[PDB]
Amino acid sequence: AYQYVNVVTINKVAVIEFNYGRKLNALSKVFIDDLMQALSDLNRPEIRCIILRAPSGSKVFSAGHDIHELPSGGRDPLSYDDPLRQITRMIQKFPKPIISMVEGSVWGGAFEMIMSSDLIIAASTSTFSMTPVNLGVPYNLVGIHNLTRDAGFHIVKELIFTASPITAQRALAVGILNHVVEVEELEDFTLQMAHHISEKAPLAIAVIKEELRVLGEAHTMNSDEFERIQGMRRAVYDSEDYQEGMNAFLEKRKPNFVGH
Amino acid sequence: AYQYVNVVTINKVAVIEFNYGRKLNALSKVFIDDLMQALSDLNRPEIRCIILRAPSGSKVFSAGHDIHELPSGGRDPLSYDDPLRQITRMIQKFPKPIISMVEGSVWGGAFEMIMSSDLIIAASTSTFSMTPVNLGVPYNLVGIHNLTRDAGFHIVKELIFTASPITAQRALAVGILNHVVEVEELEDFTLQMAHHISEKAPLAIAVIKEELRVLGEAHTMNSDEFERIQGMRRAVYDSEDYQEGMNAFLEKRKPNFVGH
Amino acid sequence: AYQYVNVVTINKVAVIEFNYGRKLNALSKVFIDDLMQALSDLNRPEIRCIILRAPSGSKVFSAGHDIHELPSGGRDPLSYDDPLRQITRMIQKFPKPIISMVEGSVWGGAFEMIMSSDLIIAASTSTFSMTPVNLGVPYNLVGIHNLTRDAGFHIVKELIFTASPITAQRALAVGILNHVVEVEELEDFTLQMAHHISEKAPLAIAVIKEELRVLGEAHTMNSDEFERIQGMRRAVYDSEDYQEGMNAFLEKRKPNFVGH
Amino acid sequence: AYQYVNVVTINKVAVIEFNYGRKLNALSKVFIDDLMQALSDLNRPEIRCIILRAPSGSKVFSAGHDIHELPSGGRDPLSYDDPLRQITRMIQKFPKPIISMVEGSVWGGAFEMIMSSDLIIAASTSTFSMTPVNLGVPYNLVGIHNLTRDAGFHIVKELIFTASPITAQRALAVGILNHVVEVEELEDFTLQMAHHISEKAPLAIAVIKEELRVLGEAHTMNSDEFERIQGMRRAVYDSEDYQEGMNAFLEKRKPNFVGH
Amino acid sequence: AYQYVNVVTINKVAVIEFNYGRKLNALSKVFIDDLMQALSDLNRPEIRCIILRAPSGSKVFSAGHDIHELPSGGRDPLSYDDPLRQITRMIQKFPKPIISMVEGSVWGGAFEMIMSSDLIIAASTSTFSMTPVNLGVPYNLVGIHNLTRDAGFHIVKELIFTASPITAQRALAVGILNHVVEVEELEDFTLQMAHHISEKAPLAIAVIKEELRVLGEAHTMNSDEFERIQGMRRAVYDSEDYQEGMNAFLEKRKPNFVGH
Amino acid sequence: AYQYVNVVTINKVAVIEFNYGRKLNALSKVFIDDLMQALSDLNRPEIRCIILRAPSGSKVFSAGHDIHELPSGGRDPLSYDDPLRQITRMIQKFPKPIISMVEGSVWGGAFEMIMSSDLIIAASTSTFSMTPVNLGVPYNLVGIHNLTRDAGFHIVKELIFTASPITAQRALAVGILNHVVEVEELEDFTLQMAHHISEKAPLAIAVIKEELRVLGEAHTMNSDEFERIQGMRRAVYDSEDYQEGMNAFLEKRKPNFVGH
Numbered sequence A, B, C, D, E, F: 001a002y003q004y005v006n007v008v009t010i011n012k013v014a015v016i017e018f019n020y021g022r023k024l025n026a027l028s029k030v031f032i033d034d035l036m037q038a039l040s041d042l043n044r045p046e047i048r049c050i051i052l053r054a055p056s057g058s059k060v061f062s063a064g065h066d067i068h069e070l071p072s073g074g075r076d077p078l079s080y081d082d083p084l085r086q087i088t089r090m091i092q093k094f095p096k097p098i099i100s101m102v103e104g105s106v107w108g109g110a111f112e113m114i115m116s117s118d119l120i121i122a123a124s125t126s127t128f129s130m131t132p133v134n135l136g137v138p139y140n141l142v143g144i145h146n147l148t149r150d151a152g153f154h155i156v157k158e159l160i161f162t163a164s165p166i167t168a169q170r171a172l173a174v175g176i177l178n179h180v181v182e183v184e185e186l187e188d189f190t191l192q193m194a195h196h197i198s199e200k201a202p203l204a205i206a207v208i209k210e211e212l213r214v215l216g217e218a219h220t221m222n223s224d225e226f227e228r229i230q231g232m233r234r235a236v237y238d239s240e241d242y243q244e245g246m247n248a249f250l251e252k253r254k255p256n257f258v259g260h
């Protein structure tokens, strides 16, 4: 029923498997629109737990935001109705637990997407990179906030400022992952936990997830502080460095950033 | 001088030992009223540090909220004056450190109670479960907030959505516990730390504890968000699933949750 | 040049080395004024990353606030324009990453200072203590907040209430440090990471750092709560214990705290 | 068409006239559901401005909440999905100006309803009463906040604590009303203002209205403060005085309030 | 029963009359202690409304804070435990309405005290001044907040920056006062209103008063902004101008302020 | 001196007279840069109060934002470093009182500018309008908040949704203006007040002004709410209606708005 995902439901658990490997499951508008439609279709009383996964043996879980669809004009790359911003809101408001079951490497916006989900179970060979400083992208407040609820600030700043991949073992040690398992155990481990969750009280799960959502969002600031930050972000997405980040990716070369 | 607790004072350290083993130290009104009286009586200048403990050899530290005192149908089970809500506020506002020294298994409200205390030192054989989703309970905002200050969101969501016990070793790894020790060393280790804290400046301890309390609570939201969450909670504590959770527990059978 | 720091630039990396070993790099006004001048001088487009370090072989990284410079009594010791409060604001608002490269022991205000920096890389032999309860000091809200973004509340309360040192290995485990390395490798490891960060997009790093700073501060409270805390702090800095803490340190004896 | 309202369109202006005079336009569930449907149906680009009115000559604009439909005992009378709570949210979120055009007396929930609208224009003979203290009702935070954006706190407390009606002339002087007009000029005056607003930029009006709505709601508090207020409200809606207020109103006698 | 106040009970209304004419009802610690004891004594179910008043015929309602009890310099003059701060908190938290009935001139902290009360009814000859800029006093955030809930910002700034007295008629027009009456009618007009309030539901009044209090306080800021303000206040109470303002009053001369 | 302003100092009062009459004191960058420099140059201890005025006899006080300089492409017209946004921040942070002394008509951004100042004294013939809905402009959160601290919400909505001029008498009645005087008395009245203020304690005035500024700004919201509002504002400044409003103004014709 979907071009870019495959859904299998057994009992009360649904697995949403990405079907966009020819583009390394990059978060293009057409891929995200399918993922959201699939989730909306599973918002039914008889579904109690969702798993998100890439196909078995994927080297790349998701290559993150489709760099071709990043606006290189004068507009904000991560506005409120950007597909990545829509799917993280939808995951976080969804009244059922969503488990990210990760095999392969996770990049940029896709790292934010799994951090927005409720649990992350990962193969021992998976790797995680947060990439905006590679491309000159001024990541937005909501998007950065979504990266701060698991690991501490010093770890988050290392991940962002270096853009270096971290292993699953390190991602477990710093609090980003729930569980790391050998890849041959990943599906069996994840289905055991999803089917267990699906026997618990769904209305209690939904209200507790929504309470955590609101508490997690409840770092408040005044209008002047947000407008000041928006001005700073606009100076970045208007920058020569932002154009250079995109151009360098599309030309398959290393960017030369100059601080303008 | 209390029916349900025993208090020992060693210089500047007070040990409050539960005496409600016939009910597995369940957080009944009569038990919590004695605990709160004991704490109030120890709010004196020559006391500097409190330890909360179950008796030596306890299999169960606390079975959590007394399910017989949970209101069935229509009343908020976790309103502001509920005993569990009163004791977590009292622990958090108490101007001396309160150390939970844990032997045995810890369940639901009792897990929130040790999470509200300042330090947790646990036996290597202790276990920890958060149980609302077993019973259909819409846990309240303040109570959920009290579970978010140590382990990250993904870990808290695993504990709540699974209601599965975690070991002391895992609870240490994820940041819930301060120390794990062999049960034979638990009392000596905890008293050594309490005596050490009691040599320090108590007015500085009290103000720093209060600063951490107000900073930990400073996740603010507007009245409409709180009323929306209260409406969601009422729908859960009015639900068939909430009645089925209570009944299933009291009848020792597996609940059948249907999502209304 | 500077009397109390030495600055070296290697390509786009600047290393600020303390030069106040005769006072164990205590945070005196004259030392902090030099550190702040050196940091302000390095806010240039050809500088991409800052390392703060003590001299190679230092037993003591920093002994913390200069206890001679604490007000005698009846005056807030951690007011907004105190040197420690100035340097942490400056580190946090600085538009380049600041890495604390730690060899030796870290005490009190100096622990808050490295916690305010972006990344901490430490020698396997370094140690960390938070000391206000040794001296009777009512640490301020901003200062305490700066200690809560890495490790959990129970961990922070143990560090503050015991004032006991922790090892680099424990500091790694609880989320305070990024990396622990053998002292012989510390400089090479830190420089390699700083050089790596120096090729990334500086405007993206600066706006993301500022987004994290704003989100990290966005725990808000009403005026009454702040004034209530300030009144509690004033009762501490007016106390006999505060005078006894100061006196004991200078006279080189154990304080006798009495709770007034 | 609608059973309980009549809608007329004059170019870009829609007038919604109450048709529930046999029950003095009391805010029963069936009347509010019709009013909300009529508003929803007018959320189309060719409508620019809404007027809410009672029929010409009405002695009673609205008698407020239907006292028969108030939750009888132990149930929150102003929960999130109560009709009065739903209509005020809808009015405030509606992307066109809504003008309350008032002829006759306004009572209780109907006063909060016109206060939630964007402008109020009233007949010189109209009167206004806020009545919960007559019935023993614990008015909810959102509802009280809606009464606080026009007149000062001393004026709102006088209105609520006395439940005394005020004249249109006094309501204008204290800032509740935009305009007071002779009854035979009311309809003409209101329509010329609605037509004038309808010539202005609708997307600008919508975003400015929504900005005012969020700034008006942005009085934020922590969870414990909300739960404490909810507990106090529950003690009121559980009180004998709350029963006495309802019963006295329905039996047409003076209530005897005793303070429990 | 009190040295410095006289209490009369009329049915369910209590009238607390100042008896400190010798010092023009300046808010000395001992006067405020009796006023607070009198309030505490009246916190009984048989009392439904309080009036605060000066004696009949008073030229001065209250000369405001006792200038002789302000500190000489280098100390916060309006700390949390100051008598003016205590009495405004107690009036705002008191579960019965408190009406200020004003005959005579109102100065400084006494103007804040009546503003903290629920309703103000004043004689046509009464006058109102806010005086901190006459004395060089840095008024505190809570205190300034208490002046902003009735008149608009421009009016409040005029009152504070000019320290010029305003008439009762002007105070009515700008929203400070509920009612202005001829002095011969003041006592019976105020009592008629207090008797009317005393017939209403007291639990409903108490919860609505508490809801208004927390909504009024719910302007939230981060710790850094509060500490920044406190630093600015400290510069003022450390200033030569603060000492000049205190000296000029003592010496009965016009202060010469210089901005240091 | 300054091309676009004239400054006269009388004792401790500085009168800043607009000198941009050929564009009716529209807020061009060149005019605002001169006003800000003149204000900065007056930040000296010997200056105690500022008056902002148009030239004596002016029909137009200020024609508002320069519509030729409004980003007429598709970028934010009211971004953080726009001249109107800069001058309102500078007026509000300025440590001396700033009185707007108004003769003539005040439009749009110029209305926000006088609302941001401390006191407004106006000629009886002056008039005031807020005009964004004439041009299709999505006024920003900070700008809208600057209009909400004097009159109530209903009055602000009437001013904005109608864009109709109000008289000085109406502006006084609704709490926008401090005083209205005959045009012949305007200088005498305003200078008498400015000289009176100039006798008072400047450090007390500066800290109380900053306390009001912070309290006035302290309506806080979460990142998601800000980003949602920014998305809505962008849809408006990208609209055909925004282009129509600008074109219509340039072509001296009535705009025809269509809701796209």
Ligand SMILES: C[C@@H](C(=O)OCCNC(=O)CCNC(=O)[C@H](O)C(C)(C)COP(=O)(O)OP(=O)(O)OC[C@H]1O[C@@H](n2cnc3c(N)ncnc32)[C@H](O)[C@@H]1OP(=O)(O)O)S(=O)(=O)O
Residues within 6 Å of the ligand: A023, A024, A026, A060, A063, A064, A065, A066, A067, A068, A070, A105, A107, A108, A109, A110, A130, A131, A132, A133, A134, A135, A137, A139
């Ligand atoms: C903006 C946010 C964001 O999420 O940005 C994207 C962040 N993602 C990345 O930076 C990952 C970039 N890609 C890679 O690092 C490598 O391509 C990986 C490791 C994903 C795969 O390497 P592999 O050797 O297996 O195969 P190639 O590199 O040769 O790429 C395969 C094809 O997919 C394109 N591709 C990869 N990622 C992509 C892609 N995110 N978009 C479009 N296109 C792609 C890539 O350009 C190539 O295109 P062609 O077929 O035209 O040669 S933020 O977080 O950074 O702020």
Ligand SMILES: C[C@@H](C(=O)OCCNC(=O)CCNC(=O)[C@H](O)C(C)(C)COP(=O)(O)OP(=O)(O)OC[C@H]1O[C@@H](n2cnc3c(N)ncnc32)[C@H](O)[C@@H]1OP(=O)(O)O)S(=O)(=O)O
Residues within 6 Å of the ligand: B024, B026, B060, B062, B063, B064, B065, B066, B067, B068, B070, B105, B107, B108, B109, B110, B130, B131, B132, B133, B134, B135, B137, B139, B249, B250
């Ligand atoms: C609602 C909140 C809360 O805190 O709820 C309570 C959560 N606590 C639990 O769910 C613990 C449930 N109990 C157990 O798991 C086991 O009873 C325990 C493991 C603690 C120990 O098991 P053990 O084999 O030693 O002996 P039994 O299960 O056989 O029970 C012994 C008696 O104690 C009662 N009991 C146990 N816990 C209880 C009890 N929290 N109350 C009343 N009653 C009990 C139980 O109903 C039984 O009663 P009878 O002797 O009358 O048959 S929330 O966090 O979940 O939202």
Ligand SMILES: C[C@@H](C(=O)OCCNC(=O)CCNC(=O)[C@H](O)C(C)(C)COP(=O)(O)OP(=O)(O)OC[C@H]1O[C@@H](n2cnc3c(N)ncnc32)[C@H](O)[C@@H]1OP(=O)(O)O)S(=O)(=O)O
Residues within 6 Å of the ligand: C023, C024, C026, C060, C062, C063, C064, C065, C066, C067, C068, C105, C107, C108, C109, C110, C130, C131, C132, C133, C134, C135, C137, C139, C249
């Ligand atoms: C107020 C905040 C704060 O940061 O407070 C300061 C916190 N710092 C400390 O508590 C560290 C206290 N010092 C020590 O633990 C030891 O002195 C150190 C361990 C770092 C190393 O000991 P070591 O054996 O190597 O050599 P000494 O102890 O013999 O001291 C050498 C000289 O340095 C002085 N000293 C050390 N720290 C200091 C010093 N922060 N100031 C002034 N003076 C000192 C100390 O008093 C001695 O002075 P003399 O010249 O009189 O011998 S808070 O965070 O606690 O609230």
Ligand SMILES: C[C@@H](C(=O)OCCNC(=O)CCNC(=O)[C@H](O)C(C)(C)COP(=O)(O)OP(=O)(O)OC[C@H]1O[C@@H](n2cnc3c(N)ncnc32)[C@H](O)[C@@H]1OP(=O)(O)O)S(=O)(=O)O
Residues within 6 Å of the ligand: D024, D026, D060, D063, D064, D065, D066, D067, D068, D070, D105, D107, D108, D109, D110, D130, D131, D132, D133, D134, D135, D137, D139, D249, D250
């Ligand atoms: C709970 C909130 C709220 O909104 O509550 C409702 C507040 N409303 C009032 O307090 C209005 C009370 N009513 C009046 O003051 C008078 O009825 C007015 C002036 C509205 C109408 O005067 P009039 O002489 O024309 O005719 P009656 O009093 O003779 O009543 C006509 C019929 O309408 C019923 N009625 C009036 N208001 C009502 C009614 N809000 N509900 C049901 N029923 C009614 C009342 O019970 C009577 O019914 P019967 O025909 O059975 O005798 S809160 O804000 O107070 O918290």
Ligand SMILES: C[C@@H](C(=O)OCCNC(=O)CCNC(=O)[C@H](O)C(C)(C)COP(=O)(O)OP(=O)(O)OC[C@H]1O[C@@H](n2cnc3c(N)ncnc32)[C@H](O)[C@@H]1OP(=O)(O)O)S(=O)(=O)O
Residues within 6 Å of the ligand: E023, E024, E026, E060, E063, E064, E065, E066, E067, E068, E070, E107, E108, E109, E110, E130, E131, E132, E133, E134, E135, E137, E139
């Ligand atoms: C600091 C805060 C505050 O509330 O400060 C106090 C604000 N109040 C004032 O500034 C009012 C100051 N007083 C006056 O303006 C006049 O004294 C009054 C007008 C109120 C009445 O004048 P009158 O001519 O009738 O008779 P006197 O001036 O002769 O004063 C009678 C005695 O009362 C003392 N007095 C007046 N107000 C006072 C007094 N607030 N304290 C102590 N003492 C006094 C004053 O010093 C004098 O003392 P001796 O008998 O020793 O001469 S803040 O809000 O300003 O920031």
Ligand SMILES: C[C@@H](C(=O)OCCNC(=O)CCNC(=O)[C@H](O)C(C)(C)COP(=O)(O)OP(=O)(O)OC[C@H]1O[C@@H](n2cnc3c(N)ncnc32)[C@H](O)[C@@H]1OP(=O)(O)O)S(=O)(=O)O
Residues within 6 Å of the ligand: F022, F023, F024, F026, F060, F063, F064, F065, F066, F067, F068, F107, F108, F109, F110, F130, F131, F132, F133, F134, F135, F137, F139
């Ligand atoms: C975006 C914000 C804002 O402030 O927008 C602007 C709001 N302002 C207005 O709507 C006022 C527009 N101006 C007028 O309506 C009229 O000019 C008034 C009534 C003020 C005065 O009319 P009058 O016939 O006496 O003499 P002119 O129209 O001839 O103007 C004199 C010179 O200044 C220019 N001017 C006037 N207002 C202006 C001007 N806001 N810009 C540029 N330029 C101007 C105008 O175009 C003319 O220049 P030229 O001599 O080159 O033709 S918001 O608040 O609306 O959102």
